[PDB]
Design a protein around this ligand. Structure first.
Ligand SMILES: CNC(=O)[C@@H]1CCCC[C@@H]1Nc1ncnc2[nH]c3cc(F)ccc3c12
Length: 167
């Protein structure tokens, strides 16, 4: 039993909800919140911009030190950093950005990072400003992640479309 409330159950381990991941993280304080990161950990917009703003830019400060030491992530890769005031840890995961021409076949590799964590609060990778089809992203998530994932979907209209079309 965990503290996540009001989710629809899609499968044994995947749950989906209409919620602002920022407000959801601040309330649940989950062990792991997933960020929709880019390779440079430049948290400028989308989910990443929202999470960073909620940390009063501390996420960005930590991220810049990480990149200065380690260099950029791989598309499809991830790193574990602090969750600041939102969660114990933030798993920064790089889904492919269709608006940059990146291979959508890397979306499965991106979701594989979730399997290193027993329970996660997460957005749909590569959705939103990353330009991929959120319906497809949900399919890859369900078919790739084996650990317990709680998806927060900000847009209520998108949430209903995701549920109504789920197979
Ligand atoms: C990297 N991909 C994206 O940003 C996507 C673009 C639009 C479709 C959904 C998805 N974003 C989100 N998913 C869950 N919670 C969210 N809270 C937010 C607060 C904000 F200010 C901005 C965006 C989100 C957001």
């Amino acid at each position: 039993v965990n503290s996540f409330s009001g989710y629809l159950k899609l499968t044994d381990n995947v749950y989906i909800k209409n919620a602002d991941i920022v407000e959801e993280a601040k309330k649940v304080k989950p062990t792991v919140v997933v960020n929709a990161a880019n390779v440079y950990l430049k948290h400028g917009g989308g989910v990443a911009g929202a999470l960073n703003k909620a940390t009063n830019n501390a996420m960005q400060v930590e991220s810049d030190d990480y990149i200065a030491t380690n260099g950029p992530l791989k598309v499809g890769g991830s790193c574990v950093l602090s969750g600041h005031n939102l969660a114990k840890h933030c798993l920064h995961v790089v889904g492919p950005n269709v608006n940059k021409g990146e291979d959508i076949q890397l979306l499965k590799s991106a979701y594989e990072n979730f399997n290193q964590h027993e329970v996660l609060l997460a957005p749909l990778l590569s959705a939103g400003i990353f330009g991929a089809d959120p319906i497809h992203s949900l399919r890859v998530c369900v078919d790739t992640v084996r650990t317990n994932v709680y998806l927060a979907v900000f847009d209520k209209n998108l949430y209903d479309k995701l549920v109504s079309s789920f197979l």
